[PDB]
Structures are given as structure tokens and as C-alpha cells.
Amino acid sequence: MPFVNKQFNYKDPVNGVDIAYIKIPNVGQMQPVKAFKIHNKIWVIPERDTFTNPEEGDLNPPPEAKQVPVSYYDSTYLSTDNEKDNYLKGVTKLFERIYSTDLGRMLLTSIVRGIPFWGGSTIDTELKVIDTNCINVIQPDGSYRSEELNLVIIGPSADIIQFECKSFGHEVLNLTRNGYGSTQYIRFSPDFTFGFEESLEVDTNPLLGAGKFATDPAVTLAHELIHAGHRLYGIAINPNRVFKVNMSGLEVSFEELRTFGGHDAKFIDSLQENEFRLYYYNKFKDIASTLNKAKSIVGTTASLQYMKNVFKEKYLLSEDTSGKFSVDKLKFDKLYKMLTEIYTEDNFVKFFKVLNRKTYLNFDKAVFKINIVPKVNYTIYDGFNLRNTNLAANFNGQNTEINNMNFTKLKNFTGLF
Amino acid sequence: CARWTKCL
Ligand SMILES: [Zn+2]
């Protein structure tokens, strides 16, 4: 039962439903872009992201000797129709690989159920969508209709390997940290991946290694989706909450350690975790109270009780006699723990049976150009480690020295730190 | 800001 039930081509004609010219609510102007709806609540825009941030409109670098070590610029990437076709197919293929695991099925199901909360209304008896959780889709008659969505995958901005999960803020509300959630825009490319080293002492050393093994891009996307899950349920950790790494005031956010999981997650001390968990549980109670006071809805895309049921389902709320909603500690803790401890990069690594960095705290060695769309290169089931070939065992398919035709090294980062 | 070395 595939996640993406159509095999889109980029040049397939627009139909205003799942192949459409859209605008995003950046609070400024833009020419429509061609987008593809690959699943309920999830869209793919094969364009370089010059739209989410008005000050990152330019695909050219900061000058030749202005730039960060782990970075890669190519202003022509993703400018042509063949590259957009291929980007679309590559991204689809990674959703299918993820979805083919039970962990991935769970995570993508929680993302689709994770509809951003309708807390846009200034009247506490009235439930309203926040419009930055929508896109504007041009219909066949050439007019615009607003469409709620949970996730957009878009190409990277100027720095091709700066993958991240962004979302539109609110004037007052902290949407990704108040339980509400907001639509998530992942900057991501399936056309590149990172090199790492199989020895831990090497991988965590800035001066050693050329990056012998390649990260499976399904792992990289899953990392971004895990962030997105947190942000859709409005439980992301404030990035100012950091762990001090111990020669340079190096720190790492808790939100990152959590997302990686494994040994790394244990560096977040128990008092602080209890404090976040209590905090988010309180946020959810504020949502339960807001739903209780809602008598009216705005719009007529759905009924008040349709939407209450939607949020009941999202937040796993208990419903008593009056149709009064409450939060049950047990169900809150299971959800919370699902989204923070079960969904983690490290867990994904076990599911995919791939070689991966052992810690979030490593020094990237290199960046490689890849092509995962041909089945002779990469499949849903095996990634690069193709069954019943010489690349099946020992992660040989990720080994850039053995599987050398699937990887072109574009830049070394080692030494430049 | 993910990636550790990009957020350093
Ligand atoms: Zn991250």
C-alpha cells in the first residue's frame, strides 16, 4: 500500500488538485511555483527555497573566502526540468523507504495526524485556522483556494547542504513550543549526501578521515521529519537549551540530541527533561480548555465537532460526559515519549540496517553527489546495499571506495575546521 | 538552524 500513490513526472500537466501552481504565506510576493501533493497533508516543491526567508533570496555565496566549512554552493542546482523531475522522484523514493519500515509508518502517520492547531481566532468561543498553516493553490479557473497542510519538502536555499526544518512564526504565539504546531517546511536534497568514518575516534576528530562511508539519505530525511514531528505537536525544545560539549565554546542543542537519540539523548539531564515534559503537558491542558470553550467555528470546510474530533485524535485527549476534554497523564506521556524517544535517528538506523554516525557530535568529512533514482543505484528496500550483489553485505553499497560509481566527492571538510 | 557543524 504505497505512501505516494502516483508516480509523478515534473512535466505532468497541472490539475489544481495534487499538481498545482501554489503560493506560500511568506508575508511578501512571489511568482507561483509548481508543487506536487504526494500524500494527504504533504506537498513537495522542487525549487530552491528562495521563498521562506525573504533575506535568503540569492543562490550565490558570501564571497569566496567568506564561507562556513561544512557548506556547498552551486547556484545552478535545481534550475532545470530534468533536475526537478529527478528531485521529485528521489524524494518520493525516500518517503517510500521510510514508510516501508514500521517506525517510519508510525512517524509518517503521526505527522499526517499532526494538524496545526486552530488557535488563530481572537475570540475564545470561536475556533479559527492560522493562515500561515495554509498554502494558496491556483484552481483550474485560475482563482486561488486556501489549503491546510502539515509538511512541505522544498529544495535548499544558497547553501545546498543546509538541511533544516522551518516554519512561519506568529506575532505572539510560539507555535512550535506551545503545543499548537505549525506547517513545516523542510529544506532537503536527495541529490547529495555526507561522508563519515566508521571509527568513532576518527569520526569525532576534526583533523582525520576523508569520509569513506556515505550517509543513507533516508536517514537524513527521517532526521528532519523527526524535528517536524516535534514541531507539529508544538513540543520542540527552545534552541537556547544547550549541552556544553566536553576547545572552542562548542555547544549542542537539546532538541538535536533528542532527535538523534541513543547515547546522545542521555546527556540531557533528568531534572530538565521532567521540566520540559511538565511544561508541554500544561500546554496540552491549555489546548483542552480552549477546545472546551469553543462554541463556534470559522469557515465551512469542516464542522466544529469534526475539528474537535481531529484535535482529540491528534493530542489523544480524554472525553467525559459533557464532551468536556481533558488530558490524561498516561496518554500524554505515551505520545510525548513516542515523538521524542521512539522517533529518533538512531532508531531509524536499526530499521534501515545501515551504517551511520554513532553520535550527533561528529565532524563531517565530505559531501558527495549521488543519484538514487535508478534502481540499479538505490532501492526502497536496501538503499545502496542492494541484496544479492557484492554491495549487500558489510554495508558495501555505502562504502564510497567500493561503490565508487555512485559517489562523486565534491568537497573535503577535514582540516578546514 | 539539523546538523551540528552547521550550527556551531
Ligand atoms: Zn537536526
| Residue numbers in A near B7 (CB within 8 A) | 252-253, 256
Q: Which of A56, A18, A379, A409 lies closest to A212, judged by CA?
A: A409
Q: Which of A278, A252, A265 has the alpha carbon at shortest distance from A179? A: A278
A164 known member of a binding site: no
CA distances from A358 to A52, A154, A161, A224, A253 (A): 32, 28, 20, 17, 17
Is the distance from CB of A150 to CB of A114 less than 8 angstroms? Answer: yes
Q: Do B3 and A239 touch (CB under 8 A)?
A: no
Helix (H) or strand (E) holding A176: none
Q: What angle do CA A227, A281, A179 make, to 5 degrees?
A: 45
Could you give the C-alpha distances from A217 to A62, A161, A187, A325, in angstroms and in order? 27, 12, 13, 41
Using an 8 Å CB-CB cutoff, list residues of chain B that contact chain A: 1-8
Beta bridge partners of A195: A214, A366
CB proximity list for A122: less than 8 A, separation 6 or greater: none
Q: Please name the amino acid found at residue A5.
A: N
**Method used to determine the 3D structure:** X-ray
Rounded Cα gap, residues A96 and A133, in angstroms: 25
Resolution of the solved structure (Å) = 1.9
Helices (H), A70-115: 81-99, 102-113
CA neighbours within 13 Å on the CB side: how many for A164? 18
Closest CA to A20 of A190, A141, A130, A183: A141
Task: Based on the residue annotation, tell me whether A224 is a catalytic residue of this protein.
Answer: yes
What is the rounded distance in angstroms from the CA atom of residue A353 to the CA atom of residue A379?
A: 13
Strand partners, A128: A119
Q: Position A408: which residue type?
A: T
Distances, alpha carbon A201 to alpha carbons A13, A98, A183, in Å: 52, 30, 39
For A94, A190, A391, A401, the CA distances from A396, given in Å and listed in that order, are: 20, 20, 4, 9
Non-local CB neighbours of A325 within 8 Å, separated by 6+ positions: A288, A291, A292, A308, A312, A317, A318, A319
Q: In Å, how far from its chain's centre is CA A20?
A: 22
Provide the shortest C-alpha distance from residue A30 to chain B (in Å): 24
Task: Give strand pairing partners of A297.
Answer: A127
A68:B6 CB<8 A: yes
Other beta carbons within 10 angstroms of residue A10's beta carbon come to 18
The closest of A410, A351, A364, A402 to A101, measured between CA atoms, is A351
Please check whether residue A412 is in contact with residue A366, taking contact to mean a CB–CB distance below 8 angstroms: yes
Closest CB to B6: pick one of A162, A361, A417. A162
Q: How many H helices and E strands in chain B?
A: 0, 0
Burial letters for A245-271: b for 16+ Cβ neighbours within 10 Å, e otherwise? eeeeeeebbbbbbbbbbbebbeebeee
CA distance A181 to A108: 16
| Beta bridge partners of residue A318, listed in sequence order | A326
Domains of chain A: 1-417 (3.90.1240.10)
Q: Please, is A12 exposed, middle or buried when counting C-beta atoms within 10 Å of its C-beta (0-12, 13-18, 19+)?
A: middle
Q: Tell which residue, A368, A385, A301, has the closest CA to residue A160.
A: A368
Q: Are A160 and A73 in contact (CB under 8 A)?
A: yes
Please give the biggest Cα pair distance in chain B: 11
Q: What is the least distance, in Å, from the CA of B7 to any CA of chain A?
A: 8
Distance from the Cα of A310 to chain B's closest Cα (Å) equals 29
d(CA A159, CA A410) in angstroms, rounded, equals 14
C-alpha cell at A323: 464532551
